[PDB]
Write a protein that binds this ligand. Structure first.
Ligand code: EF2
Ligand code: ZN
Length: 97
């Protein structure tokens, strides 16, 4: 009901609408959902900063633990003075609804 599930297998809740937050700027200074918390995702490999969509963070591939659908990434801060230190960037089209 606030629940966002893996579109491919529909088994797993990956996150909730309660966890959604925005890193995009609202003044003169979409496709990827950013949430504080997620569940039922397996991380693949090790963090990388290459081509990072969120400067200051590294990314690790995150896939549904059941069906292995590539749902998004875990982003982890490269510096201690950043907040949050970690979040999830999820491909919207990989989630239901
Ligand atoms: O923050 C991110 C997450 C990883 C994402 N990524 C991809 O989706 C991708 C596909 C193929 C080759 C290389 C990449 C890449 O770095 C990307 O470009 N930036
Ligand atoms: Zn799945």
């Amino acid at each position: 009901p606030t629940s966002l599930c893996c579109k491919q297998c529909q088994e797993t809740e990956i996150t909730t609408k309660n966890e959604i937050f925005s890193l995009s700027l609202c003044g003169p200074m979409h496709e990827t959902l950013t949430v504080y918390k997620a569940s039922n995702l397996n991380l693949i490999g090790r963090p990388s900063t290459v081509h990072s969509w969120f400067p200051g963070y590294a990314w690790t591939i995150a896939q549904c633990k059941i069906c292995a659908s590539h749902i998004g990434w875990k982003f982890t801060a490269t510096k201690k003075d950043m907040s949050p230190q970690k979040f999830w960037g999820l491909t919207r089209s990989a989630l239901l609804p």
